Scaffold this active site. Structure first.
Site, mmCIF file in Angstrom:
data_model
loop_
_atom_site.group_PDB
_atom_site.id
_atom_site.type_symbol
_atom_site.label_atom_id
_atom_site.label_comp_id
_atom_site.label_asym_id
_atom_site.label_seq_id
_atom_site.Cartn_x
_atom_site.Cartn_y
_atom_site.Cartn_z
ATOM 1 N N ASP A 99 0.980 -0.732 -0.344
ATOM 2 C CA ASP A 99 -0.069 0.199 -0.044
ATOM 3 C C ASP A 99 0.806 1.293 0.146
ATOM 4 O O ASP A 99 1.102 1.498 1.299
ATOM 5 C CB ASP A 99 -0.710 -0.435 1.163
ATOM 6 C CG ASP A 99 -2.135 0.929 0.857
ATOM 7 O OD1 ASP A 99 -2.181 2.306 0.398
ATOM 8 O OD2 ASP A 99 -3.215 1.135 2.311
ATOM 9 N N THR A 100 1.345 1.535 -1.028
ATOM 10 C CA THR A 100 1.689 2.874 -1.208
ATOM 11 C C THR A 100 0.773 4.134 -0.626
ATOM 12 O O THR A 100 1.407 5.050 -0.630
ATOM 13 C CB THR A 100 2.201 3.507 -2.967
ATOM 14 O OG1 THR A 100 0.689 4.047 -3.828
ATOM 15 C CG2 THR A 100 2.712 2.364 -3.396
ATOM 16 N N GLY A 101 0.362 4.017 -0.570
ATOM 17 C CA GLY A 101 -1.186 4.962 0.052
ATOM 18 C C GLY A 101 -0.785 5.533 1.784
ATOM 19 O O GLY A 101 -1.953 5.934 2.491
#
Lengths: 99, 99
Positions: B25-27
């Protein structure tokens, strides 16, 4: 471009005749923006869920330019704390994760 | 590996003597897992916020193996709908976004 993840991947996007900052979010299924007037039809859509559902406006086949390359996909317009670029648009940009 | 984003980037992780499925999850800023007994000290930590705060257990310098490469970083242990691999661990793996 190659983007490292030491900080949040905020990029500059061109959409609907406006310039906005958004987050490249591999953890989001969809692309959500706020405060924009997109062209064409829209259908209401309930998204999210955990804690309750939130209604947004679904516009289809919307163009978004990011660092040179353009993507066309569905954009949800409604309240959101950060503009999110979900996988539906990341894939249209050819975006991958590499390590 | 190179991972396309047509589907959710769920990977298999080795941590704390267990095997678990988690989301790249880059977010997400942090790495959150649920249902595990990590070694060493832990301090309580309030995370999230929107809708209310959630208390988790913060373990530092925890090893996680993903597709061969190992990362050491802070892991938050508490309730979460999906196991998240945040940027704090993605960066330790040398993970980048490329398009």
């Amino acid at each position: 471009p190659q983007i490292t993840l030491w900080k949040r991947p905020l990029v500059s996007i061109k959409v609907g005749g406006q310039i906005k900052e958004a987050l490249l979010d591999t953890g989001a299924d969809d692309t959500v923006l706020e405060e924009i007037n997109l062209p064409g039809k829209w259908k209401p859509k309930m998204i999210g869920g955990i804690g309750g559902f939130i209604k947004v406006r679904q516009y289809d086949q919307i163009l978004i330019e990011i660092c040179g390359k353009k993507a066309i996909g569905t954009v949800l317009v409604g309240p959101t704390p950060v503009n999110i670029i979900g996988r539906n648009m990341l894939t249209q940009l050819g975006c991958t994760l590499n390590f």
